[PDB]
């Protein structure tokens, strides 16, 4: 009797805690921090794909994955910051190459602020009133940033 592949129940999403170099398909190599959707498991292995590259699918060790979730408002807000940071990051590099110094710097500071605030949001260390003021500073910077970079204008959630 060999370990059969079965649907992954509560282990739906995870993040790689180390770089996993696979030996090629069916194994999916992972870089630390990669977020994956886990579809099945069999023994000490998961089968799934990279959330940001769903075409890249395969198996990887359970040991290289930390199971997380993907409800308190600060959580989805934290998620919006992550998504926002990736979109700004791409444009930030183009600002760099074209030497648009003012915009480059402005975007650089907004990214550091958002990363820091997101970390504060996820810390669970802020008292109620302060947290509310922090959420507002976050949504305001996301919206302003999206505006000057000419990205899609988000609507409260």
């Amino acid at each position: 009797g060999m370990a059969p592949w079965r649907k992954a129940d509560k282990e739906r999403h995870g993040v790689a805690i180390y770089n996993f170099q696979g030996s090629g398909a069916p194994q999916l190599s992972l870089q630390i921090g990669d977020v994956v959707r886990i579809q099945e498991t069999c023994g000490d292995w998961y089968r799934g794909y990279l959330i940001k590259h769903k075409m890249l699918q395969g198996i990887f060790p359970k040991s290289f994955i930390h199971i997380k979730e993907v409800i308190p408002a600060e959580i989805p807000l934290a998620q919006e910051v992550t998504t926002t940071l990736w979109e700004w990051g791409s444009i930030w590099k183009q600002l760099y190459v074209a030497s648009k110094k003012e915009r480059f710097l402005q975007v650089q500071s907004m990214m550091y602020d958002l990363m820091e605030w997101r970390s504060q949001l996820l810390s669970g260390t802020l008292p109620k009133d302060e947290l509310k003021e922090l959420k507002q500073k976050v949504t305001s910077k996301i919206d302003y940033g999206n505006k000057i970079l000419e990205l899609d204008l988000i609507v409260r959630d």
Binding site: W5, K7, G33, Q57, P61, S63, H66, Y96
Partner: protein, 190 residues
Amino acid sequence: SGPILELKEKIQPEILELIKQQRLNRLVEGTCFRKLNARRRQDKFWYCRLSPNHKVLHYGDLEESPQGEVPHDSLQDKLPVADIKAVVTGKDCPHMNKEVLELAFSILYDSNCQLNFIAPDKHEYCIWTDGLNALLGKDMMSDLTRNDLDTLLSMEIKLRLLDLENIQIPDAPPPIPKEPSNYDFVYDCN
């Protein structure tokens, strides 16, 4: 860290590529320099710029006034890149205060020809030395490349680790288990 260093090594190349592109774009925009020991009605300022295709450097004198800086070229107007044999800096410079040593660099080409510069500041010094080296297929060594690398690479890493927030990163590689005994998956691909 172990895995983070590994990730930096994988991304570092593309970042160095962006930096090279930034440096060259700057050369193309060109910069204004101030000649050392210019006198008797000689323009004190001049400029140099790299052609948009990256093959020749155009240069000449300038007119530094409250209004602007109109550039008026002379007979000697260019220095093709393909004819560049070397770039020297500091005491290696033929035209070589001390504050100037740090901003001095020269383009040696053809026979015994040489185009000598005195960067307006450390920043421009790095931009040009990095740019010329890139053109010459050499590595960019300025402190600005090191800082730009650290700035862009650190951001990429932080972005990559966002979802590792409040999660423990092992010191050593987790154990790689034996491969599965079968591959009869429940679901399809894509």
